[PDB]
Design an enzyme around this catalytic site. Structure first.
Site, PDB file in Angstrom:
ATOM      1  N   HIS A 157      -6.358  11.654  11.563  1.00 37.06           N
ATOM      2  CA  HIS A 157      -5.777  11.830  10.368  1.00 37.06           C
ATOM      3  C   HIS A 157      -6.902  12.886   9.326  1.00 37.06           C
ATOM      4  CE1 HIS A 157      -7.211   7.741   8.637  1.00 37.06           C
ATOM      5  NE2 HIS A 157      -7.989   8.679   7.539  1.00 37.06           N
TER       6      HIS A 157
ATOM      7  N   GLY B  30     -12.872   7.074   2.501  1.00 34.21           N
ATOM      8  CA  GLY B  30     -13.816   7.765   3.285  1.00 34.21           C
ATOM      9  C   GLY B  30     -14.511   6.859   4.289  1.00 34.21           C
TER      10      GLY B  30
ATOM     11  N   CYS C  33     -13.144   5.733   7.120  1.00 33.11           N
ATOM     12  CA  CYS C  33     -12.460   5.724   8.296  1.00 33.11           C
ATOM     13  C   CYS C  33     -13.535   6.536   9.047  1.00 33.11           C
ATOM     14  CB  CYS C  33     -11.077   6.751   8.101  1.00 33.11           C
ATOM     15  SG  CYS C  33      -9.914   5.603   7.475  1.00 33.11           S
TER      16      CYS C  33
HETATM   17  C1  LIG Z   1      -9.890   6.227   5.797  1.00 34.93           C
HETATM   18  N1  LIG Z   1     -10.770   7.056   5.357  1.00 34.93           N
HETATM   19  C2  LIG Z   1      -9.016   5.230   4.793  1.00 34.93           C
HETATM   20  C3  LIG Z   1      -9.395   4.038   4.623  1.00 34.93           C
HETATM   21  C4  LIG Z   1      -8.713   3.337   3.757  1.00 34.93           C
HETATM   22  C5  LIG Z   1      -8.606   3.967   2.234  1.00 34.93           C
HETATM   23  C6  LIG Z   1      -8.177   3.130   1.079  1.00 34.93           C
HETATM   24  C7  LIG Z   1      -8.826   1.607   1.035  1.00 34.93           C
HETATM   25  N2  LIG Z   1      -9.162   1.043   2.108  1.00 34.93           N
HETATM   26  C8  LIG Z   1      -9.244   1.736   3.649  1.00 34.93           C
HETATM   27  O1  LIG Z   1      -9.290   1.070   4.424  1.00 34.93           O
HETATM   28  N3  LIG Z   1      -7.674   5.276   5.465  1.00 34.93           N
HETATM   29  C9  LIG Z   1      -6.320   5.978   4.893  1.00 34.93           C
HETATM   30  O2  LIG Z   1      -6.442   6.278   3.552  1.00 34.93           O
HETATM   31  C10 LIG Z   1      -5.202   5.845   5.339  1.00 34.93           C
HETATM   32  C11 LIG Z   1      -4.574   6.848   6.263  1.00 34.93           C
HETATM   33  C12 LIG Z   1      -3.169   7.215   5.555  1.00 34.93           C
HETATM   34  C13 LIG Z   1      -3.286   6.456   4.630  1.00 34.93           C
HETATM   35  N4  LIG Z   1      -4.215   5.409   4.693  1.00 34.93           N
HETATM   36  C14 LIG Z   1      -3.847   4.073   4.331  1.00 34.93           C
HETATM   37  O3  LIG Z   1      -4.796   3.217   4.561  1.00 34.93           O
HETATM   38  C15 LIG Z   1      -3.178   3.501   3.522  1.00 34.93           C
HETATM   39  N5  LIG Z   1      -2.429   2.377   4.033  1.00 34.93           N
HETATM   40  C16 LIG Z   1      -0.921   2.305   4.406  1.00 34.93           C
HETATM   41  O4  LIG Z   1      -0.192   3.122   4.486  1.00 34.93           O
HETATM   42  C17 LIG Z   1      -0.480   1.240   4.899  1.00 34.93           C
HETATM   43  F1  LIG Z   1      -0.224   0.031   4.099  1.00 34.93           F
HETATM   44  F2  LIG Z   1       0.597   1.401   5.849  1.00 34.93           F
HETATM   45  F3  LIG Z   1      -1.389   0.322   5.924  1.00 34.93           F
HETATM   46  C18 LIG Z   1      -3.332   3.066   2.087  1.00 34.93           C
HETATM   47  C19 LIG Z   1      -1.990   2.779   1.293  1.00 34.93           C
HETATM   48  C20 LIG Z   1      -4.116   4.373   1.389  1.00 34.93           C
HETATM   49  C21 LIG Z   1      -4.265   1.957   1.814  1.00 34.93           C
HETATM   50  C22 LIG Z   1      -3.075   6.964   7.212  1.00 34.93           C
HETATM   51  C23 LIG Z   1      -2.631   5.786   7.577  1.00 34.93           C
HETATM   52  C24 LIG Z   1      -3.171   8.097   8.195  1.00 34.93           C
END
Ligand SMILES: *C(=N)[C@H](C[C@@H]1CCCNC1=O)NC(=O)[C@@H]1[C@@H]2[C@H](CN1C(=O)[C@@H](NC(=O)C(F)(F)F)C(C)(C)C)C2(C)C
Ligand SMILES: *C(=N)[C@H](C[C@@H]1CCCNC1=O)NC(=O)[C@@H]1[C@@H]2[C@H](CN1C(=O)[C@@H](NC(=O)C(F)(F)F)C(C)(C)C)C2(C)C
EC number: 3.4.19.12
Lengths: 306, 306
Positions: free
Chosen positions: A41, A143, A145
């Site tokens: 992503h 950030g 991930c």
């Molecule tokens: C990676 N950088 C990031 C880590 C998140 C950021 C928010 C706080 N804690 C974390 O672990 N990953 C993402 O933002 C990520 C990516 C896009 C959305 N998402 C999510 O973690 C979302 N969660 C969900 O959609 C779900 F509930 F289904 F798990 C949220 C709403 C931003 C937390 C994708 C899945 C590609």
């Protein structure tokens, strides 16, 4: 003496962390030999997140679209491909700090250390368990991930987790290093929820042995139980079934303390039915299930890594 | 989201760990530039432990009596001296992995990471607090002495602790890197006990703010209190006095959440008087006091180290 939630030393993994930027999105990558592994992503815009077609998005990317940085040094990308939910970026420089390593898919109940990173730089290290519902109880911000989880054995780093997302309860989901998710999750911003979790019974037993080894023995009773009858009680309290394999794995701790596994099961049964009455075990007011039997032995015997 | 007891990444310290053997005793040392720092009781036999005359014992030692090893590599000792309860062994090779570093004497209430080591090799890393009674609640076995505790800031490693001994409650005592003990302890096998400990109030407040930031807000009440009246209650429950300095330090978290420090004090007062009624805060059934305000901000804002 003493018993702490202890993480592996992180140095071997620190040397592998890089920053990956594509367009406006920056996250972390893992640099091993001449490949950088990161969540796919990174190639998304904020709008692409509800339902991205990753295969399509990547078709429109060139090597030069990926900015990879190791510290201040730029690493030129010379090829790229997707494997499940991870991207593999071939770079023109092999990481000179690459440890001996394996990629492993861990089992529910197993533990690993997470090296939390932002912009390719490490923030901290903590120990996690793969929950029965394929989540982990982490600490992760925007950030983070591409931060990874790992075990060390001697000199070999077994990478088992890459971070991708956060689920509604404030729990975390990710992939193995071949990009396959743990659990039924997908890398898109849609409605997803963790399944009901359960307590890792073999790990609670391991931690009770650790308590005995450290001299905290108040909860030991004089009784035994059968495996079948214990699991009927464990089920009521949302504990995982204990198997004979689990009993065999607890063998070393049972031998060290002289307490049969089924005798410890009888003591755990009483804790579940009666509570702790305001007492603590190893400083805790709740039963702890994020130490494996191997974790207990390694910490109580001083195993080191080179 | 999420909140974990997080340790600093240990890589910069891993590169400084060596083994020191004198006679039959082996423990760990810290190699910085061309000096190795270790506990002076490496020069003792098991019999010398009740009341060693360290100045006398060291008089009879030569450089060659000290075997120092960095991995498999022997480091030749070319001079030696004692500074309080530490030995400084000058070696013929400067450590090429020496980080930017300082020696600091931490204050009670402050936190640091411990890199637990045996035979010069790291076993694990965990986060500790300097207790009000100058002990830490660690995890340490035979051979762990010379393991160090540290903080990182940007690229600078501040070494603050070296491990020396274990006290009857299963708690741990050691020195700063100039060899001065924390607390009233001495490096001899005689009767010593930790003083009564107290709970670090400013840190409990910090962790309550962390809970609010993560969405765990059930314990917030509608009241306020004065500083003086709060400290009368804190005293009864063996909590440290809260000072205006402490209030000022909590400023950033109070500003972020919009909760005045004295309003949080009123909520903590209620927890102390009434308990938690089986509820948890950030997953804990007990109030946590081993996160500083800086720890909370760094973890909830993603501060990294290079
Ligand atoms: C990676 N950088 C990031 C880590 C998140 C950021 C928010 C706080 N804690 C974390 O672990 N990953 C993402 O933002 C990520 C990516 C896009 C959305 N998402 C999510 O973690 C979302 N969660 C969900 O959609 C779900 F509930 F289904 F798990 C949220 C709403 C931003 C937390 C994708 C899945 C590609
Ligand atoms: C360092 N290698 C070692 C660490 C101990 C080992 C036992 C388990 N946990 C630890 O932290 N340090 C020592 O063995 C050490 C040295 C000699 C005795 N001592 C102790 O820690 C003793 N404790 C005490 O004497 C006292 F209670 F006063 F704290 C015990 C009885 C071995 C724990 C000296 C102080 C020179």
């Amino acid at each position: 003496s003493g018993f702490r939630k202890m993480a592996f030393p992180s140095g071997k993994v620190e040397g592998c962390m890089v920053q990956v930027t594509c367009g406006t999105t920056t996250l972390n990558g893992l640099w091993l030999d001449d490949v950088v592994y990161c969540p796919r992503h990174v190639i998304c815009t904020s709008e692409d997140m509800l339902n991205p077609n990753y295969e399509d998005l990547l078709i429109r990317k060139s090597n030069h679209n990926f900015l990879v940085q190791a510290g201040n040094v730029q690493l030129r990308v010379i090829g790229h491909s997707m494997q499940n939910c991870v991207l593999k970026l071939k770079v023109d420089t092999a990481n000179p700090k690459t440890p001996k390593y394996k990629f492993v898919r861990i089992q529910p109940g197993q533990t690993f250390s997470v090296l939390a990173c932002y912009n390719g730089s490490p923030s901290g290290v903590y120990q996690c368990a793969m929950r029965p519902n394929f989540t982990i109880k982490g600490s992760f911000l925007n950030g983070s991930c591409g931060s990874v989880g790992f075990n060390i054995d001697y000199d070999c780093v077994s990478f088992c987790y890459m971070h991708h997302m956060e689920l509604p309860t404030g729990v975390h989901a990710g992939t193995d290093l071949e990009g396959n998710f743990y659990g039924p999750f997908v890398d898109r911003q849609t409605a997803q929820a963790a399944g009901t979790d359960t307590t890792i019974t073999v790990n609670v037993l391991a931690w009770l042995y650790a308590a005995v080894i450290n001299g905290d023995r108040w909860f030991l009773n004089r009784f035994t139980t059968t495996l079948n009858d214990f699991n009927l009680v464990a089920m009521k309290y949302n504990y995982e079934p204990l198997t004979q394999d689990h009993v065999d794995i607890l063998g070393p701790l049972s031998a060290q303390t002289g307490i049969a596994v089924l005798d410890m099961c009888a003591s755990l049964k009483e804790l579940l039915q009666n509570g702790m009455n305001g007492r603590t075990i190893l400083g805790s007011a709740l039963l702890e299930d994020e130490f494996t039997p191997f974790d207990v032995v390694r910490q109580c015997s001083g195993v080191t890594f080179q």
